[PDB]
Structure 1
């Protein structure tokens, strides 16, 4: 696919993509419901994090997959922006749960589809 991380209209462009098209992106992409359960998880993300994109669907991102993100600086921003319905935040973060610590840039943005929220990731 031909979509850049951080693009202004990213939520419109990604709405057309099934799992296979999402796997064509240059950056990691996760879709979460408002509780943090994983709805979609692409190949680029699995390459960064080590997780098997097929196995993490249905797991809770904050409680089980990514406890290092269960903090005010990541989960706190997510749950606030879900509550307001206007989630659009970008920040760097380090992933260090049972993995070599890996610093990334994270972009969380509310999707167009109902009860759906994007988490985009690239290496920094």
Structure 2
């Protein structure tokens, strides 16, 4: 396992340019999105939480295709505001309920260091 805690202040530096295999070593779910919400990376811990197959969701749009329950002001709205402003950093609880048992999580969205890239971190609550 990689020694990184959910919510750590410099998480974007520690994860920066992490390849797919190392991302799978994290204790929490990690997704990397472009500014439109297309999925660039999606780790094993996230797949274990959500049921999605990490290899198949790459390239899909998170808000339009994979996760319509997040297409709302409280999730997508916050994401796109942070993309538009270039500085996103927000943490909030949410319930995932699309075609799977409703599952409450804590979500941390934070702008990455790499261009046109934005992290969505997830753990169970």
TM-score, normalization: structure 2? 0.99
What residue is the counterpart of 1:15 in the other structure?
Answer: 16
Structure 1 unmatched runs, 5+: none
Say how many residue pairs are matched.
Answer: 124
Q: How far 1:16 sits from its partner (Å)?
A: 4.0
User: Structure 2: 5+ residue runs without aligned partners?
Assistant: none
CA contact (8 A) 2:17 2:114 kept: no
Q: By how many angstroms is 1:15 displaced?
A: 0.7
- Give the Cα separation in 2 of the matches to 1:84 and 1:123: 28
- For the residues of structure 1 that align with 2:17 and 2:117, how far apart are their CA atoms? 14
TM-fit CA distance, 1:17:
1.5
1:29-70: per-residue Cα shift (whole Å, max 9, x none)?
A: 000000000000000000000000000000000000000000
Task: Give the whole-Å Cα distance in 1 for the aligned partners of 2:83 and 2:17.
Answer: 22
